[PDB]
Symmetry: none
Subunit: 82 residues, 4 copies
Amino acid sequence: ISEFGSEPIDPSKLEFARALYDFVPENPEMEVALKKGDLMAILSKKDPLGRDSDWWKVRTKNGNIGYIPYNYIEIIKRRKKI
Amino acid sequence: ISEFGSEPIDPSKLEFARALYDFVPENPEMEVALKKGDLMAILSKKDPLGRDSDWWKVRTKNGNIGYIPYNYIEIIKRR
Amino acid sequence: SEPIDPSKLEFARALYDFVPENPEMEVALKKGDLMAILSKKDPLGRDSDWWKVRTKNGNIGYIPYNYIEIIKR
Amino acid sequence: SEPIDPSKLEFARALYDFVPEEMEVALKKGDLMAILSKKDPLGRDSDWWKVRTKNGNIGYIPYNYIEIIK
């Protein structure tokens, strides 16, 4: 495949988020570190096995890709309500 | 007054809390730092003016005293 | 100290007074003071919450970043 | 580095492999080490800790890569 799969991605379904709290990975190999107010792209809401998980894989401003607890972030809403 | 007022206190009313997330004060003079997991004793839920607030005054493990957002902590429940 | 990149050179204003506890590496600041940020890194290279600054009086030293505010255009 | 207090002397095991940042120490899942200090070259609370490898190597490592034993 490609970095983001094989089929086309609809840019309208791409979600963004802002970290609500600082976060230090308990697992430095699977997770990413966050500072309150960081923005990121939500790449997937499934674990490595393909299961629905409360840990979401994201891509931070740094370019780092790892998981973060869903309740530690805020999905930016449409138009302006961030 | 004493450190905690003048009227006797009811023990089964004192609440303790556990930090849910790390917290860095935006106001170092009014707030206390925190690390996820930290224990504390809740002194009061009133702001410095006596009003209700989302900022509670706590006594940390260290002995520090300051305010922390209420949604950043978890009040420990019973037996 | 170290020659600063003209990109990351920022000036800060102190929001609260800071009384050094360890004047060895800590600098004194009074609410409202102006200072240049020398580095956002710790003694041993690594992003820390203690920034190295330069006082208006030329004093170098570390300070907690939440005591200051970057003066933005 | 310097004399440690018999109260704060702890041993840790490496939870995940760690690759040096030559100014710090290298780790491999499973390795043992003694935690000399949970501070920095300044003395303030830090995420990085100073340790001594089983091979006598000293240097800093991210505290979330290790686990204090017992």
